Ligand binder design. Structure first.
Ligand SMILES: CCCCCCCCOCCOCCOCCOCCO
Ligand SMILES: CCCCCCCCOCCOCCOCCOCCO
Ligand SMILES: [Ca+2]
Length: 428
């Protein structure tokens, strides 16, 4: 198939993003999303384009990787698979899906040069990336954190025993911006800091993200060191405070495949925080979605809550989950989280909650998530297409989170909050 059209209809219900502390923050809306694509392959070469047309009753989210209507170019790349005789080896250039199984490093569409090498024994990847635009009719300027930020990254891992992998992973980001000079008026679209960061990681998995595992016990474990420096802006520009960064992040999980249908598991993750001038404040690459198959179903789930959508930054999370599935027809995940701040005086990086944290309070909150999918036989897509992980065929899916703020959110804030979606996907 050289041509296709992915059709997505979505309802999003959100209430209340700011927990009743500001105007807005709510949605209860519907949208249709059309994505015509073209694929072609000749010799060692291939090329790919995917566009996007969206019309919605309000500004809802139609993917998990501003006007009510817009057009976009999501993907456009050329690929060359002639460098070696390995079938799992190719080099890809242009705007593409950068993804890794945990989703905690990269899960995004971005302009890139990315080299992939996959074999039974050994997987490796290396690449560079940078955003130059959103390629959307409704956005004119990059987010400040993306402006002039380059990414270089790589990974290498081996399968040391059947279904068990271990490997290393690295990523580096350089903010080569010229922070607003002293005096000038700081724009909302201006950077809040610049610097250079390196993440060095080790990871071990045993069918961690394999929903068809032949093993009764699956696991994941990763440890990541973050080091570099930052120059932070101090609305008129007073100057900058430069400082080193040395921080740490970890993520652990166990999953028991009770039988072919039923699974249960637990998880823990921490990203350091605090220190002088935020020296020990861990943070992620900025390319991550934090979504994966950690509950052991075909459906991906936000590692840190559909609702809270925590970033691993001054953040501690404990997780409990069950999941069910029936062949390739259905799946469902039930997930419970509790969240804490590591340093009760610093912020917690990005989330799906826009409300101030009270100093001295560690109890961020807790959340219950439900994910339910029915898959249809029609629209079977080849595993080589990037959307395969989320939308391998036509399907209908419910994805929801209910968040209960803890003491870290003072009085005046709502006692409950939710974000929930229904997604319907059809493919022509
Ligand atoms: C503007 C696109 C340039 C990308 C190079 C395409 C590869 C050339 O294909 C020629 C096929 O002949 C073999
Ligand atoms: C099985 C998950 C265990 C995680 C418990 C960690 C709680 C530590 O933070 C409490 C403050
Ligand atoms: Ca509100």
């Amino acid at each position: 198939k050289n041509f296709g059209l992915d059709v997505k209809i979505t309802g999003e219900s959100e209430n209340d993003r700011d927990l009743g502390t500001a105007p807005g923050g709510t949605l209860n809306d519907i949208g249709i999303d059309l994505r015509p694509w073209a694929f072609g392959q000749w010799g060692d070469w291939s090329a790919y384009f995917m566009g996007q047309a969206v019309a919605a009753t309000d500004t809802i989210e139609t993917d998990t990787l501003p006007d009510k209507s817009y057009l976009a170019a999501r993907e456009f790349w050329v690929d060359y698979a002639g460098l070696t005789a390995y079938p799992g080896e190719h080099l890809r250039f242009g705007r593409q899906r950068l993804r890794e199984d945990s989703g905690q490093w990269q899960d995004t569409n971005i302009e890139a040069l990315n080299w992939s090498f996959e074999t039974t024994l050994l997987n490796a990847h290396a690449g560079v990336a940078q955003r130059f635009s959103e390629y959307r009719t409704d956005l004119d300027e990059l987010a400040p954190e993306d402006k002039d930020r380059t990414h270089v990254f790589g990974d290498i891992s081996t399968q040391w025993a059947p279904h068990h992998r271990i490997g290393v992973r690295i990523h580096h980001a350089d903010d080569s911006g010229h922070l607003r000079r002293p005096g000038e008026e700081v724009d909302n679209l201006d950077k809040t800091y610049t610097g250079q960061l390196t993440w060095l990681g080790i990871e071990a998995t045993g069918d961690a993200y394999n929903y068809r595992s032949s093993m009764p016990l699956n696991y994941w474990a990763s440890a990541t060191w973050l080091t570099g420096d930052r120059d932070n802006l101090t609305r008129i520009a007073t100057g900058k405070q430069s400082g080193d960064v040395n921080a740490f992040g970890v993520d652990l999980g166990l999953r028991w495949n009770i039988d072919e249908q039923w699974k249960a598991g637990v998880g823990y993750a921490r990203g350091s925080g605090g220190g002088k001038d935020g020296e020990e404040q861990f943070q992620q690459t900025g390319l991550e979605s934090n979504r994966s198959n950690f509950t052991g179903t075909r459906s991906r789930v936000h590692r840190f809550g559909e609702a809270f959508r925590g970033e691993l930054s001054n953040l501690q999370a404990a997780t409990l989950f069950g999941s069910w599935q029936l062949r390739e027809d259905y799946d469902a995940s039930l997930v419970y989280h509790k969240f804490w701040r590591v340093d009760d005086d610093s912020d917690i990086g990005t989330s799906g909650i826009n409300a101030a944290l009270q100093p001295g309070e560690k109890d961020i909150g807790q959340e219950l998530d439900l994910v339910v999918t029915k898959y249809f036989k029609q629209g079977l897509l080849p595993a080589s297409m990037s959307q395969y992980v989320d939308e391998p065929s036509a399907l209908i899916r419910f994805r929801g989170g209910l968040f209960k703020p803890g003491d870290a959110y003072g009085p005046g804030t709502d006692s409950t909050m939710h974000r929930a979606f229904v997604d319907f996907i059809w493919r022509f």
